[PDB]
């Protein structure tokens, strides 16, 4: 059927176009899964690490990336395209403060990211950066937020978030999870953020195999959890 | 490796009455930290079944009396915590908890002609909680059935 | 065969064939041999006639007072690199007022030939430059290749059927460091006479010899002054 | 396969084969290993003699980027020379704009983004090189990095690049590298080279050992192994 | 305009007047002559007002972007280099009297001086501005090596008040700032 | 097929890649727009794929000036480009003429933007059609652009999926003179023709033009408007 537009970025007879939607299955060669959860006044990123070597280090592995002092992110997809995406995110976050004189909202930043990913679809002759980005941040008079940017130039903000390999299995768990009206008191958030990834991947991970980024109304600085207190939340859910 | 936990269990069965049984539950988390290790061959399932045998034997002596609540609250203690104890992602379902309670439902077969109907169905309603999860697969698949027939 | 079209396209074996084909243009040109002693570096080339009465095409060309090069391959890429070569030699004279070190001039060539071996729109340079020179630490013999690699060496022969010249150089390289120019030159042109078909002889009209010395400026001798060098030779054992 | 011509096109399952093809061109090059002790980084390159006319020190693969930074390249040698001049030029602008030496964590990011840019356009091809970056400082200690042709760059304690990438790191990890000094490392690097195929089906070789750490006071230079020749004296005793 | 900077064992002590004038008319009566760049690095500015405000915004943009990439607190010598790269390049166009001071974890308290020319030099104490010429004989007969923090706050208060005695480009109110490892203490002195 | 490209003709007819770009317009979300006697009503369809998506984050009815609004049916990522183009283009009229730009003037210029990507070749056309409303000089207006670059002036129309059922609905429905309040009543009643199962206050999103300027409706009114009014 296909044929017609499976090399370059032009239209297919009546349908769409294939080179952009081949980047959606370009995330899955990472072999990884990330989960973001917004329940109440805090916000939690959780993502496992996969260290296949003892000669390989520990500090230079983390996918949690601090964009500004109040905005952190996590990256999926292939590795080299992910870091160049972060370099644009760190750059244009500082241009907002210079041009406009105040801290950039987390909502405004995904507009500036997806529009750069838009030109690479509209205008040809550059590979469109097969990686995905998830943001968290605290907004005044709006609470915490979770955003996702796509390689096509799409973005949408939403409460419970999965990415990587296992979206359709983790989001299926979180639809049944976020339907009851339970409150989310900063450990209801984390324990659901663990046990969703822990059952979909089926790992119920040992303490040294993940990362957890957090932000909370109290201390709006982006914060990467210590390995000791990761064990404290792990012994909390399994009493 | 875990023979030190066996000779400490040799101490606690003498000190069920000489010392108080909460101290048996105070020597217990060291044997849990031994089960927290559980690496390859040293302190793993075969020797873990011995502490699981001796902690149930101490649970037999402590709750042979009408103070029954200790054997039950020790179970929802450890059987919710075994996901954090031994091996994560469904441990083994292999001789880490099975015969420790397959002995106990055999004890519920013994006490049903001795103990009255009230604390034994409190005993059954607290063992139905983890029998619904696992431990009735094969071998003693009737760990549920020899006690749900008792409920009839 | 579809991978064999451009410089940009990699192969499923990991070998770019367009660089591998520019090596074949070096084998089209004639043979030339360069070598050096502790004090003197001499490179000897072999002319080729076009017709029976045209002039023979020159190979060795002067560059600077302490640098001279040989040639093998395309004449289009020959003079295009020469004009880049002469411009860099006089810039150090104009700015630094010193002659160039020979080892760092050739590093400019590998940076020069690297861009047309990666970006689309220009073929690699089909060229076989042999380089002799004098920095402050004695003579040097350099070669280049269209794969933009440059090799320091003490003796080298490249061009048509130049493998037989390499076999002569390997079993006489122990003698090269001590002997002076009266035989060091005719150590070199005994290596050219195995790169010939066995019926004709190296005459005075088809050979060039260039000598640069520690106290000697680079000088090209051809067709009249080769006769004090071709005297005192034996024939081939036929 | 077929859709594998440009570097700006995707496969139907979602990977770029032009990056995949350039990775196993590094595989055909000889083995170059890297290792760091608690107070320094020690390089080591197995390098083979072409025929005989090599002049004992030509076309080396142990470069020198900065006062305290050098490379351990392997793959296409001409492509690594142009890439080394980028890192020389990148560290100069950091000096002229900030007034102090480049951190190795920031230097590897600037190089890997430059390698990344040649994996996006149809006009250019990806590089065919992989290399090492080792440095030492008093406020940062010793670091050791690793850059593939795709542009992924992060840190190791030990590595190998060449044919025997797996066959070298099997016996690197049985060393107690966290507490050794980098004078004892030098006699241990030379046996890792000579175990795995130095001249067995090949003709000849020559060992090169680069060297940076506390004993050099932050300088990067080649070993004085020419002095006392102790690397080959200690490694050739491992014949049995 | 008179600015002041003295380092001590812990960190540095800054100080300035306000009195932004034009001709013989005071336009601004109270003025923040010292400007935060990072959490530990301040600068006090002198010269043309519109020139120094434009430079201090660009350095805060460049240094603030630069420290997030390294994931490290920046050096005080790094910040003083960025003012040098703009004042020396755009000379014959700017009139800036920037003095950079602040605490650093690697080196402690540092004070740098970038005058109208474009040079950079580290000093123990530093003066600047139009009214700084009148206290040059007082500041070196009073300075003593090995002061505490409370002596330096006493030192710069008497030192500014002599330049702020009457001199027409100086006076107003004293704004002081102390930068150390713990925090930044800023206070306003009058009477 | 000849097509494959944009800079050449077919031997028989017209440009084929622009026709394929219109196929992506028909596979978009449905929309409707009705020009009444005192105003123009825009209404569109907006369903999330899950219960997780925040509905109050990204909007469909999007104001350009204080009297001009705009909807679409196509791909939202291409939609955000020409919206930001039309914002800055509308300010260039106001800096010159010091007067709010009439609605017939943007459509001269916005269609000339969508014109320009149908050139070159190394570029693709849009996959978005538009509907532009506004009340300038008393009379209200309702236009429609396309990726080819032409434009219109509608009484009532419907784009997106199942537009032929909405067109035969509106052909049987739309009269000449009604108020704006009767216009929204037949604008949701044509959205119910091709919508999915549940239609809440968050499934639709409706904006209007008065003579008092452009306004989009908050879900408090839209819940109270869809409350049993057919």
PDB file of N, CA and C in Angstrom, chain A residues 3 5-8 18-20 22-23 25-27 29 52-58 60-61 78-85 87 120 124-130, chain D residues 2-3 7-16 19 35-36 109-110 113 116 119-122 144-145 150-159 169 172-173 177-178:
ATOM      1  N   UNK A   3       4.467   2.420   0.027  1.00  0.00           N
ATOM      2  CA  UNK A   3       5.303   2.902  -1.069  1.00  0.00           C
ATOM      3  C   UNK A   3       5.459   4.409  -1.184  1.00  0.00           C
ATOM      4  N   UNK A   5       5.027   7.286   0.206  1.00  0.00           N
ATOM      5  CA  UNK A   5       5.777   8.335   0.900  1.00  0.00           C
ATOM      6  C   UNK A   5       6.513   7.749   2.104  1.00  0.00           C
ATOM      7  N   UNK A   6       7.385   6.799   1.831  1.00  0.00           N
ATOM      8  CA  UNK A   6       8.032   6.091   2.913  1.00  0.00           C
ATOM      9  C   UNK A   6       9.531   6.345   2.920  1.00  0.00           C
ATOM     10  N   UNK A   7      10.013   7.260   2.082  1.00  0.00           N
ATOM     11  CA  UNK A   7      11.405   7.692   2.101  1.00  0.00           C
ATOM     12  C   UNK A   7      11.547   9.101   2.668  1.00  0.00           C
ATOM     13  N   UNK A   8      10.843  10.067   2.087  1.00  0.00           N
ATOM     14  CA  UNK A   8      10.936  11.454   2.510  1.00  0.00           C
ATOM     15  C   UNK A   8       9.585  11.907   3.050  1.00  0.00           C
ATOM     16  N   UNK A  18       4.591   9.053   6.814  1.00  0.00           N
ATOM     17  CA  UNK A  18       5.139   7.925   7.555  1.00  0.00           C
ATOM     18  C   UNK A  18       6.445   8.214   8.274  1.00  0.00           C
ATOM     19  N   UNK A  19       7.248   9.162   7.787  1.00  0.00           N
ATOM     20  CA  UNK A  19       8.554   9.409   8.384  1.00  0.00           C
ATOM     21  C   UNK A  19       8.463  10.021   9.773  1.00  0.00           C
ATOM     22  N   UNK A  20       7.424  10.803  10.049  1.00  0.00           N
ATOM     23  CA  UNK A  20       7.229  11.304  11.403  1.00  0.00           C
ATOM     24  C   UNK A  20       6.753  10.184  12.316  1.00  0.00           C
ATOM     25  N   UNK A  22       7.360   7.122  12.018  1.00  0.00           N
ATOM     26  CA  UNK A  22       8.413   6.159  12.295  1.00  0.00           C
ATOM     27  C   UNK A  22       9.307   6.614  13.434  1.00  0.00           C
ATOM     28  N   UNK A  23       9.284   7.905  13.768  1.00  0.00           N
ATOM     29  CA  UNK A  23       9.997   8.371  14.947  1.00  0.00           C
ATOM     30  C   UNK A  23       9.287   7.993  16.233  1.00  0.00           C
ATOM     31  N   UNK A  25       8.105   5.023  16.914  1.00  0.00           N
ATOM     32  CA  UNK A  25       8.721   3.756  17.266  1.00  0.00           C
ATOM     33  C   UNK A  25      10.237   3.848  17.303  1.00  0.00           C
ATOM     34  N   UNK A  26      10.785   5.059  17.233  1.00  0.00           N
ATOM     35  CA  UNK A  26      12.204   5.270  17.455  1.00  0.00           C
ATOM     36  C   UNK A  26      12.536   5.519  18.918  1.00  0.00           C
ATOM     37  N   UNK A  27      11.528   5.731  19.764  1.00  0.00           N
ATOM     38  CA  UNK A  27      11.772   5.797  21.199  1.00  0.00           C
ATOM     39  C   UNK A  27      12.138   4.417  21.734  1.00  0.00           C
ATOM     40  N   UNK A  29      13.828   1.831  20.990  1.00  0.00           N
ATOM     41  CA  UNK A  29      15.140   1.194  21.033  1.00  0.00           C
ATOM     42  C   UNK A  29      15.927   1.543  22.285  1.00  0.00           C
ATOM     43  N   UNK A  52      24.525  -2.045  32.590  1.00  0.00           N
ATOM     44  CA  UNK A  52      24.954  -3.387  32.171  1.00  0.00           C
ATOM     45  C   UNK A  52      26.426  -3.698  32.397  1.00  0.00           C
ATOM     46  N   UNK A  53      27.171  -2.857  33.111  1.00  0.00           N
ATOM     47  CA  UNK A  53      28.606  -3.056  33.236  1.00  0.00           C
ATOM     48  C   UNK A  53      29.070  -2.557  34.594  1.00  0.00           C
ATOM     49  N   UNK A  54      30.057  -3.250  35.154  1.00  0.00           N
ATOM     50  CA  UNK A  54      30.685  -2.801  36.387  1.00  0.00           C
ATOM     51  C   UNK A  54      31.728  -1.725  36.150  1.00  0.00           C
ATOM     52  N   UNK A  55      32.337  -1.696  34.963  1.00  0.00           N
ATOM     53  CA  UNK A  55      33.273  -0.630  34.628  1.00  0.00           C
ATOM     54  C   UNK A  55      32.540   0.669  34.339  1.00  0.00           C
ATOM     55  N   UNK A  56      31.277   0.571  33.945  1.00  0.00           N
ATOM     56  CA  UNK A  56      30.441   1.733  33.712  1.00  0.00           C
ATOM     57  C   UNK A  56      30.125   2.419  35.035  1.00  0.00           C
ATOM     58  N   UNK A  57      30.108   3.751  35.012  1.00  0.00           N
ATOM     59  CA  UNK A  57      29.965   4.538  36.231  1.00  0.00           C
ATOM     60  C   UNK A  57      28.513   4.570  36.703  1.00  0.00           C
ATOM     61  N   UNK A  58      28.231   5.442  37.665  1.00  0.00           N
ATOM     62  CA  UNK A  58      26.888   5.552  38.213  1.00  0.00           C
ATOM     63  C   UNK A  58      26.363   6.973  38.081  1.00  0.00           C
ATOM     64  N   UNK A  60      27.111   9.345  35.804  1.00  0.00           N
ATOM     65  CA  UNK A  60      26.912   9.824  34.444  1.00  0.00           C
ATOM     66  C   UNK A  60      25.836   9.049  33.695  1.00  0.00           C
ATOM     67  N   UNK A  61      24.873   8.469  34.406  1.00  0.00           N
ATOM     68  CA  UNK A  61      23.839   7.652  33.789  1.00  0.00           C
ATOM     69  C   UNK A  61      22.470   8.329  33.848  1.00  0.00           C
ATOM     70  N   UNK A  78      16.209   7.585  22.109  1.00  0.00           N
ATOM     71  CA  UNK A  78      17.635   7.354  21.954  1.00  0.00           C
ATOM     72  C   UNK A  78      18.430   8.476  22.612  1.00  0.00           C
ATOM     73  N   UNK A  79      19.662   8.150  22.998  1.00  0.00           N
ATOM     74  CA  UNK A  79      20.395   8.948  23.973  1.00  0.00           C
ATOM     75  C   UNK A  79      20.930  10.245  23.373  1.00  0.00           C
ATOM     76  N   UNK A  80      21.551  10.165  22.193  1.00  0.00           N
ATOM     77  CA  UNK A  80      22.234  11.326  21.628  1.00  0.00           C
ATOM     78  C   UNK A  80      21.258  12.401  21.168  1.00  0.00           C
ATOM     79  N   UNK A  81      20.094  12.008  20.649  1.00  0.00           N
ATOM     80  CA  UNK A  81      19.083  12.996  20.296  1.00  0.00           C
ATOM     81  C   UNK A  81      18.429  13.614  21.520  1.00  0.00           C
ATOM     82  N   UNK A  82      18.483  12.936  22.665  1.00  0.00           N
ATOM     83  CA  UNK A  82      17.846  13.462  23.863  1.00  0.00           C
ATOM     84  C   UNK A  82      18.617  14.645  24.429  1.00  0.00           C
ATOM     85  N   UNK A  83      19.949  14.566  24.437  1.00  0.00           N
ATOM     86  CA  UNK A  83      20.745  15.606  25.080  1.00  0.00           C
ATOM     87  C   UNK A  83      20.771  16.892  24.268  1.00  0.00           C
ATOM     88  N   UNK A  84      20.711  16.794  22.939  1.00  0.00           N
ATOM     89  CA  UNK A  84      20.642  18.000  22.122  1.00  0.00           C
ATOM     90  C   UNK A  84      19.289  18.678  22.254  1.00  0.00           C
ATOM     91  N   UNK A  85      18.249  17.901  22.551  1.00  0.00           N
ATOM     92  CA  UNK A  85      16.949  18.473  22.866  1.00  0.00           C
ATOM     93  C   UNK A  85      16.991  19.246  24.179  1.00  0.00           C
ATOM     94  N   UNK A  87      19.656  20.797  25.372  1.00  0.00           N
ATOM     95  CA  UNK A  87      20.462  21.999  25.167  1.00  0.00           C
ATOM     96  C   UNK A  87      19.627  23.155  24.636  1.00  0.00           C
ATOM     97  N   UNK A 120      11.044  20.951  11.498  1.00  0.00           N
ATOM     98  CA  UNK A 120      11.752  19.809  10.935  1.00  0.00           C
ATOM     99  C   UNK A 120      10.807  18.862  10.213  1.00  0.00           C
ATOM    100  N   UNK A 124      12.073  20.190   5.177  1.00  0.00           N
ATOM    101  CA  UNK A 124      12.762  18.913   5.155  1.00  0.00           C
ATOM    102  C   UNK A 124      14.242  19.107   5.478  1.00  0.00           C
ATOM    103  N   UNK A 125      15.032  18.065   5.198  1.00  0.00           N
ATOM    104  CA  UNK A 125      16.498  18.076   5.235  1.00  0.00           C
ATOM    105  C   UNK A 125      17.049  18.310   6.642  1.00  0.00           C
ATOM    106  N   UNK A 126      16.450  17.621   7.624  1.00  0.00           N
ATOM    107  CA  UNK A 126      17.023  17.390   8.950  1.00  0.00           C
ATOM    108  C   UNK A 126      16.250  16.277   9.649  1.00  0.00           C
ATOM    109  N   UNK A 127      16.963  15.346  10.280  1.00  0.00           N
ATOM    110  CA  UNK A 127      16.319  14.213  10.932  1.00  0.00           C
ATOM    111  C   UNK A 127      15.581  14.672  12.189  1.00  0.00           C
ATOM    112  N   UNK A 128      14.320  14.280  12.362  1.00  0.00           N
ATOM    113  CA  UNK A 128      13.492  14.925  13.388  1.00  0.00           C
ATOM    114  C   UNK A 128      13.585  14.366  14.802  1.00  0.00           C
ATOM    115  N   UNK A 129      14.788  14.055  15.301  1.00  0.00           N
ATOM    116  CA  UNK A 129      15.114  13.997  16.736  1.00  0.00           C
ATOM    117  C   UNK A 129      14.231  13.021  17.525  1.00  0.00           C
ATOM    118  N   UNK A 130      14.432  11.733  17.271  1.00  0.00           N
ATOM    119  CA  UNK A 130      13.552  10.721  17.826  1.00  0.00           C
ATOM    120  C   UNK A 130      13.661  10.492  19.323  1.00  0.00           C
TER     121      UNK A 130
ATOM    122  N   UNK D   2      18.171  -0.345   2.039  1.00  0.00           N
ATOM    123  CA  UNK D   2      17.504   0.266   0.904  1.00  0.00           C
ATOM    124  C   UNK D   2      17.085   1.640   1.368  1.00  0.00           C
ATOM    125  N   UNK D   3      16.489   1.667   2.552  1.00  0.00           N
ATOM    126  CA  UNK D   3      16.072   2.900   3.180  1.00  0.00           C
ATOM    127  C   UNK D   3      17.261   3.286   4.033  1.00  0.00           C
ATOM    128  N   UNK D   7      21.441   9.575   5.973  1.00  0.00           N
ATOM    129  CA  UNK D   7      21.466   9.631   7.424  1.00  0.00           C
ATOM    130  C   UNK D   7      20.278  10.388   7.994  1.00  0.00           C
ATOM    131  N   UNK D   8      19.413  10.928   7.141  1.00  0.00           N
ATOM    132  CA  UNK D   8      18.238  11.666   7.577  1.00  0.00           C
ATOM    133  C   UNK D   8      16.952  10.876   7.383  1.00  0.00           C
ATOM    134  N   UNK D   9      17.047   9.576   7.113  1.00  0.00           N
ATOM    135  CA  UNK D   9      15.882   8.736   6.893  1.00  0.00           C
ATOM    136  C   UNK D   9      15.786   7.678   7.981  1.00  0.00           C
ATOM    137  N   UNK D  10      14.559   7.261   8.259  1.00  0.00           N
ATOM    138  CA  UNK D  10      14.266   6.245   9.255  1.00  0.00           C
ATOM    139  C   UNK D  10      13.957   4.912   8.593  1.00  0.00           C
ATOM    140  N   UNK D  11      14.239   3.842   9.315  1.00  0.00           N
ATOM    141  CA  UNK D  11      13.825   2.517   8.905  1.00  0.00           C
ATOM    142  C   UNK D  11      12.346   2.329   9.224  1.00  0.00           C
ATOM    143  N   UNK D  12      11.695   1.319   8.636  1.00  0.00           N
ATOM    144  CA  UNK D  12      10.312   1.019   9.041  1.00  0.00           C
ATOM    145  C   UNK D  12      10.157   0.541  10.476  1.00  0.00           C
ATOM    146  N   UNK D  13      11.230   0.124  11.152  1.00  0.00           N
ATOM    147  CA  UNK D  13      11.135  -0.194  12.570  1.00  0.00           C
ATOM    148  C   UNK D  13      11.750   0.865  13.479  1.00  0.00           C
ATOM    149  N   UNK D  14      12.471   1.838  12.929  1.00  0.00           N
ATOM    150  CA  UNK D  14      12.827   3.007  13.711  1.00  0.00           C
ATOM    151  C   UNK D  14      14.279   3.196  14.109  1.00  0.00           C
ATOM    152  N   UNK D  15      15.224   2.868  13.233  1.00  0.00           N
ATOM    153  CA  UNK D  15      16.626   3.151  13.509  1.00  0.00           C
ATOM    154  C   UNK D  15      17.326   3.580  12.229  1.00  0.00           C
ATOM    155  N   UNK D  16      18.473   4.228  12.392  1.00  0.00           N
ATOM    156  CA  UNK D  16      19.248   4.747  11.272  1.00  0.00           C
ATOM    157  C   UNK D  16      20.444   3.829  11.063  1.00  0.00           C
ATOM    158  N   UNK D  19      24.233   5.295  10.885  1.00  0.00           N
ATOM    159  CA  UNK D  19      24.945   5.317  12.153  1.00  0.00           C
ATOM    160  C   UNK D  19      25.391   3.908  12.520  1.00  0.00           C
ATOM    161  N   UNK D  35      42.218   3.276  31.258  1.00  0.00           N
ATOM    162  CA  UNK D  35      42.016   2.887  32.648  1.00  0.00           C
ATOM    163  C   UNK D  35      42.466   4.051  33.521  1.00  0.00           C
ATOM    164  N   UNK D  36      41.831   4.202  34.680  1.00  0.00           N
ATOM    165  CA  UNK D  36      42.227   5.242  35.615  1.00  0.00           C
ATOM    166  C   UNK D  36      42.380   4.652  37.011  1.00  0.00           C
ATOM    167  N   UNK D 109      30.959  17.187  26.432  1.00  0.00           N
ATOM    168  CA  UNK D 109      29.645  17.579  25.941  1.00  0.00           C
ATOM    169  C   UNK D 109      29.753  18.398  24.664  1.00  0.00           C
ATOM    170  N   UNK D 110      30.757  19.272  24.577  1.00  0.00           N
ATOM    171  CA  UNK D 110      30.911  20.112  23.394  1.00  0.00           C
ATOM    172  C   UNK D 110      31.355  19.297  22.187  1.00  0.00           C
ATOM    173  N   UNK D 113      28.228  16.832  20.993  1.00  0.00           N
ATOM    174  CA  UNK D 113      27.226  17.556  20.223  1.00  0.00           C
ATOM    175  C   UNK D 113      27.717  17.881  18.822  1.00  0.00           C
ATOM    176  N   UNK D 116      27.302  14.770  16.943  1.00  0.00           N
ATOM    177  CA  UNK D 116      25.872  14.555  16.739  1.00  0.00           C
ATOM    178  C   UNK D 116      25.370  15.258  15.483  1.00  0.00           C
ATOM    179  N   UNK D 119      25.154  13.473  12.077  1.00  0.00           N
ATOM    180  CA  UNK D 119      24.270  12.319  12.004  1.00  0.00           C
ATOM    181  C   UNK D 119      22.835  12.720  11.689  1.00  0.00           C
ATOM    182  N   UNK D 120      22.632  13.904  11.129  1.00  0.00           N
ATOM    183  CA  UNK D 120      21.296  14.447  10.933  1.00  0.00           C
ATOM    184  C   UNK D 120      21.007  14.848   9.498  1.00  0.00           C
ATOM    185  N   UNK D 121      22.018  15.261   8.747  1.00  0.00           N
ATOM    186  CA  UNK D 121      21.821  15.804   7.415  1.00  0.00           C
ATOM    187  C   UNK D 121      22.222  14.793   6.352  1.00  0.00           C
ATOM    188  N   UNK D 122      21.601  14.915   5.182  1.00  0.00           N
ATOM    189  CA  UNK D 122      21.921  14.045   4.060  1.00  0.00           C
ATOM    190  C   UNK D 122      23.164  14.488   3.304  1.00  0.00           C
ATOM    191  N   UNK D 144      37.449   9.766  33.147  1.00  0.00           N
ATOM    192  CA  UNK D 144      37.693   8.995  31.938  1.00  0.00           C
ATOM    193  C   UNK D 144      36.382   8.847  31.185  1.00  0.00           C
ATOM    194  N   UNK D 145      36.366   9.277  29.925  1.00  0.00           N
ATOM    195  CA  UNK D 145      35.146   9.369  29.135  1.00  0.00           C
ATOM    196  C   UNK D 145      35.270   8.518  27.876  1.00  0.00           C
ATOM    197  N   UNK D 150      27.908   7.673  17.357  1.00  0.00           N
ATOM    198  CA  UNK D 150      26.585   8.278  17.425  1.00  0.00           C
ATOM    199  C   UNK D 150      26.569   9.552  18.255  1.00  0.00           C
ATOM    200  N   UNK D 151      27.430   9.656  19.261  1.00  0.00           N
ATOM    201  CA  UNK D 151      27.485  10.826  20.110  1.00  0.00           C
ATOM    202  C   UNK D 151      27.138  10.598  21.565  1.00  0.00           C
ATOM    203  N   UNK D 152      26.953   9.355  21.988  1.00  0.00           N
ATOM    204  CA  UNK D 152      26.672   9.060  23.385  1.00  0.00           C
ATOM    205  C   UNK D 152      27.976   9.150  24.165  1.00  0.00           C
ATOM    206  N   UNK D 153      27.983   9.957  25.223  1.00  0.00           N
ATOM    207  CA  UNK D 153      29.216  10.266  25.941  1.00  0.00           C
ATOM    208  C   UNK D 153      28.947  10.245  27.437  1.00  0.00           C
ATOM    209  N   UNK D 154      29.533   9.273  28.136  1.00  0.00           N
ATOM    210  CA  UNK D 154      29.477   9.226  29.590  1.00  0.00           C
ATOM    211  C   UNK D 154      30.692   8.476  30.117  1.00  0.00           C
ATOM    212  N   UNK D 155      30.783   8.399  31.443  1.00  0.00           N
ATOM    213  CA  UNK D 155      32.021   8.025  32.097  1.00  0.00           C
ATOM    214  C   UNK D 155      32.139   6.559  32.475  1.00  0.00           C
ATOM    215  N   UNK D 156      33.386   6.087  32.483  1.00  0.00           N
ATOM    216  CA  UNK D 156      33.758   4.729  32.844  1.00  0.00           C
ATOM    217  C   UNK D 156      34.832   4.763  33.923  1.00  0.00           C
ATOM    218  N   UNK D 157      35.174   3.578  34.426  1.00  0.00           N
ATOM    219  CA  UNK D 157      36.455   3.381  35.094  1.00  0.00           C
ATOM    220  C   UNK D 157      37.492   2.746  34.186  1.00  0.00           C
ATOM    221  N   UNK D 158      37.058   1.938  33.230  1.00  0.00           N
ATOM    222  CA  UNK D 158      37.961   1.325  32.271  1.00  0.00           C
ATOM    223  C   UNK D 158      37.211   0.991  31.003  1.00  0.00           C
ATOM    224  N   UNK D 159      37.940   0.949  29.888  1.00  0.00           N
ATOM    225  CA  UNK D 159      37.306   0.718  28.598  1.00  0.00           C
ATOM    226  C   UNK D 159      38.302   0.132  27.610  1.00  0.00           C
ATOM    227  N   UNK D 169      37.927  -6.073  28.254  1.00  0.00           N
ATOM    228  CA  UNK D 169      37.237  -5.676  29.475  1.00  0.00           C
ATOM    229  C   UNK D 169      36.846  -6.856  30.353  1.00  0.00           C
ATOM    230  N   UNK D 172      39.957  -6.532  32.501  1.00  0.00           N
ATOM    231  CA  UNK D 172      40.119  -5.238  33.153  1.00  0.00           C
ATOM    232  C   UNK D 172      39.405  -5.237  34.495  1.00  0.00           C
ATOM    233  N   UNK D 173      38.199  -5.804  34.539  1.00  0.00           N
ATOM    234  CA  UNK D 173      37.346  -5.748  35.717  1.00  0.00           C
ATOM    235  C   UNK D 173      37.807  -6.653  36.852  1.00  0.00           C
ATOM    236  N   UNK D 177      41.319  -1.435  40.853  1.00  0.00           N
ATOM    237  CA  UNK D 177      41.742  -0.145  40.326  1.00  0.00           C
ATOM    238  C   UNK D 177      41.389   1.028  41.228  1.00  0.00           C
ATOM    239  N   UNK D 178      40.565   0.817  42.255  1.00  0.00           N
ATOM    240  CA  UNK D 178      40.136   1.922  43.103  1.00  0.00           C
ATOM    241  C   UNK D 178      41.235   2.407  44.037  1.00  0.00           C
TER     242      UNK D 178
END
